[PDB]
Amino acid sequence: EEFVCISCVEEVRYSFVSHLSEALRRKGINNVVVDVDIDDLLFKESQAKIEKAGVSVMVLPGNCDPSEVWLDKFAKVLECQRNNKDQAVVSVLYGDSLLRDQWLSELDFRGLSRIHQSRKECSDSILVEEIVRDVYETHFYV
């Protein structure tokens, strides 16, 4: 049973991410959520979730400067990918005031090219469906 690991900051754990998780489940795609804001104690005990995931969906705080977010919070998520080079990484730039050019630069530097983004007056429900369709058709549909 392949599954998806969604990583995020605590601010969207119970809002946007909860809808994303439920939409994946409705599609028949098992998933777990990892809050990157937890102590590195609990993170160590959660690393296996990320490492064993067939798909890693990183939901990024797109309103924030990547220079204060990536190394601090998300580098530890991506490093889990090499314990599984069958693992795909999908990135989501989420927020109502994206530092879009900054994040696109950041993701390119990290070698990440599969990117979904919040858009002006585009509904989050549509964004969720877009992420689900991508994960589903790429990895759970043949």
Added chain:
Amino acid sequence: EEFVCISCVEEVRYSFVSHLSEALRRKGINNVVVDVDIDDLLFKESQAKIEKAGVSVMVLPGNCDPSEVWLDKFAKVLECQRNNKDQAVVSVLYGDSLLRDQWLSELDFRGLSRIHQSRKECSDSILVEEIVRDVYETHFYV
């Protein structure tokens, strides 16, 4: 074809409300969304949506003082109910920092008793499902 009208402020139109709308649609429940922050010009042209709705779901900005919100923005929604006393009203106190006691007082004063609320570390996806189950079983299931 009975339908639901969801009223809300612009801040949650494309986030929480979009998930609520999509969840109602998945359940087979037709629905439309009215943004209460629009000009009273466009509101007049949207009154019919509210008046003809079998269920009016008011998604309220629960982090805000009801004394600055209700009369200003939502009284005009509830007044549409009497053009249809077959119309039920469901209220949702949405926000991550609810002025809960203030809003409960406000709703009681308005004669409204069907109330869903954001809860500490309770997912919005669950809140949506709760609202959908209530609307569905009360009005679209016999």
